[PDB]
Ligand binder design. Structure first.
Ligand SMILES: CN1c2c(nc(N)[nH]c2=O)NC[C@@H]1CNc1ccc(C(=O)N[C@@H](CCC(=O)O)C(=O)O)cc1
Length: 385
């Protein structure tokens, strides 16, 4: 299986992220297809995603490496199929809450594929496979967005037919996941090994990056989404951003930079670049600079997605046991915790309610201080002689 091991896995990663009808879930609900209201979707349906995500991210990471990453990938595929079954056949708001819960389950289980990538290949070329995997996933997301948008805009396709197409694609993704090769008080032993592994320098630094920079990137992405929502150029920017992320993840898969040294400077410079990109993003105004702003966000996802195929790799090379998925899940869970803490701090009305521009200035400052802390840490241990 020289061709059936990593090529097939990246093929499945690409085809499992194809969902032409995913990007139009809201407008499909708000129309002469479900007869929903904006208030119903934005109170009783959308927050169910957040509730379920920061509840189901825990068991998924806790047991995902125990059952060898294949059954939970099949569960993610079946959960996408269940999401689209609820979408095609759902009237009460309870069914849409169930659909949001299942979509949250898939979002939680993405880490399972992220770690199954490392569980398959031999622990030597981890980086070159992480890059390929992230590139395949981002190509899948970009293809899904492009296909859905061109099907609804260039062609004349009703949302029902698009959702049927997406259901067929998800069924094929489940069929593809069926054939994946399954690799070879447990909680106390796992926690002890987790604490033992966190003492390593590279794993510690990159886990901190995943906890903080990923949370910042999620916050920035969601708030650019709401800011642009608050039109064809929106999908154009999102698709271009995903494409640049895929290209940069492939490049990171090809990167040869040493990691014992010349690594903290790398993360510091990448985070500083992200801070500058958000800095430019916040202060765009009525003039055509918005177009230039449209580029900056793309470069934003051209930076964070340049480090995920590296970070995961650098965590896969520092975990002696087969706990490469528990650490990824802990990092994602804590990133979600940090993101929701910040959202409670600023986004909510009961919190420090500020305009979106103020939020983006605050995120620029937060990325800048993260990069400054990383730079200070790099300089503190620079000599050690
Ligand atoms: C279905 N969800 C939803 C909706 N719209 C409504 N009205 N209700 C919903 O529940 N639109 C899609 C949304 C899903 N929300 C999200 C949240 C995060 C990501 C997300 O993780 N995007 C990745 C892109 C790359 C990838 O998929 O791996 C990211 O980097 O943020 C996707 C959808």
């Amino acid at each position: 299986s020289w061709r059936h091991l990593v090529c097939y896995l990246c093929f499945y990663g690409f085809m499992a992220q194809i969902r032409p009808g995913e990007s139009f879930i809201t407008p499909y609900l708000l129309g002469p297809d479900k007869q929903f209201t904006r208030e119903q979707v934005t109170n009783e349906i959308t927050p169910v995603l957040s509730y379920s995500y920061l509840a189901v991210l825990v068991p998924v990471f806790l047991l995902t490496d125990y059952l060898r990453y294949t059954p939970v990938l099949l569960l993610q595929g079946l959960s996408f199929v269940s999401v689209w079954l609820l979408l095609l056949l759902g009237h009460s708001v309870a069914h849409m809450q169930l659909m949001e819960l299942f979509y949250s389950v898939t979002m939680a289980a993405r880490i399972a594929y992220s770690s199954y990538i490392f569980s398959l290949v031999r622990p030597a070329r981890y980086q070159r496979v992480a890059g390929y995997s992230r590139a395949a996933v981002l190509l899948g997301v970009f293809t899904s967005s492009v296909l859905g948008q061109l099907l609804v805009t260039v062609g004349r396709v009703s949302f029902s037919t698009l959702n049927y197409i997406s259901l067929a694609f998800l069924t094929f993704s489940v069929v593809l996941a069926l054939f994946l090769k399954r690799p070879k008080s447990v909680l106390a032993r796992m926690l002890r090994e987790l604490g033992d592994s966190l003492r390593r320098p590279q794993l510690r630094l990159w886990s901190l990056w995943w906890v903080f920079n990923s949370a910042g990137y999620y916050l920035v992405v969601y708030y650019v989404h709401i800011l642009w929502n608050e039109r064809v150029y929106n999908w154009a920017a999102d698709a271009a951003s995903t494409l640049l992320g895929a290209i940069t993840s492939f490049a990171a898969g090809f990167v040869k930079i040493r990691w014992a040294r010349w690594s903290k400077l790398l993360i510091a410079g990448v985070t500083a670049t992200q801070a500058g990109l958000v800095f430019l993003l916040a202060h765009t105004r009525h003039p055509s600079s918005i177009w230039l702003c449209y580029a900056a966000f793309v470069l934003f996802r051209g930076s964070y997605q340049f480090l995920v195929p590296i970070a995961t790799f650098q965590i896969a090379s520092s975990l002696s046991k087969e706990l490469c998925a528990l650490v990824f899940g802990v990092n994602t869970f804590f990133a979600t915790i940090v993101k929701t803490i910040i959202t409670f701090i600023v986004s909510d009305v009961r919190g420090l309610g500020l305009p979106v521009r103020k939020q983006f200035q605050l995120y620029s400052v937060y990325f800048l201080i993260l990069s400054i802390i990383y730079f200070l840490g790099a300089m503190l241990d620079g000599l050690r002689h």
